[PDB]
Design a protein around this ligand. Sequence first.
Ligand SMILES: O=c1ccn([C@H]2C[C@H](O)[C@@H](COP(=O)(O)O)O2)c(=O)[nH]1
Length: 285
Amino acid sequence: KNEDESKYLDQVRYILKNGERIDDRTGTGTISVFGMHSVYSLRNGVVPVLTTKRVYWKGVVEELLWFIRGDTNAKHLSEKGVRIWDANGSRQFLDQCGFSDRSEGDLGPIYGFQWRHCGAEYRGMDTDYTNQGIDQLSEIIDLIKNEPHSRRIILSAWNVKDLKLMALPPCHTLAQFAVRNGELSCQLYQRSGDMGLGVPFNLASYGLLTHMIAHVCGLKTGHLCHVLGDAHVYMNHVDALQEQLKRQPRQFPTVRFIGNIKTIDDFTYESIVLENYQPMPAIKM
Ligand SMILES: O=c1ccn([C@H]2C[C@H](O)[C@@H](COP(=O)(O)O)O2)c(=O)[nH]1
């Protein structure tokens, strides 16, 4: 039944069999295919959270709420027990990236800052940016409500002028939205995805975001197109993914929202209910 997860497993199988063996910017071995595409149904509450290996759903939600706040302070995420950005905000990493002037936790003008304040001058995570720069997230919700057929509904973190200030240039580079049949769909352009850890997390994240926007706009959800540039498996993850490929997918979970959620800024951890998520165990990578 879960044909959509079967497609992710086929992408991993295709990469292992046909990918090129290349060392990345760190000197770490990868197996890579440039240019891959997959579609996931979001209909009837479905969020494409992989069942063949547990996805860090708590991390997905807290990260997304922290993006929506426009927050770039890794400590605010770490304080909810989500440490995924902590390495990139560490005194050691900041100094290595020539950000010696930044406070620990300051990731620079990454996703949250771009989504809510695109074009504003970044002056550190502790600065108040209220009403500074372009609120892309507000703008795309305005377009979906007022001009649902627009070909111009883009959320982009790839701010060229800001790339040098970021802890990391964005892997999930831009997302286009469209409405058909009163159904909101999303196409995510991901320049770089590790099939082991990153890509499943990112699929859950953009699936959830599309549902949250659809909810606040009074729309059903259609599909998520996932477009990859460098689709890769780290050499030291090959055995873990060969393990995952032996597993048969279960049905994807569904999401529903509780409370009086009127705007994108009103979602809380507690307002987001994930239903029937029973994955096989996380695999050690
Ligand atoms: O949301 C994210 C963040 C990172 N990565 C992975 C992809 C790469 O393996 C690495 C980023 O390295 P570059 O592509 O920037 O070299 O992290 C993802 O897959 N998703």
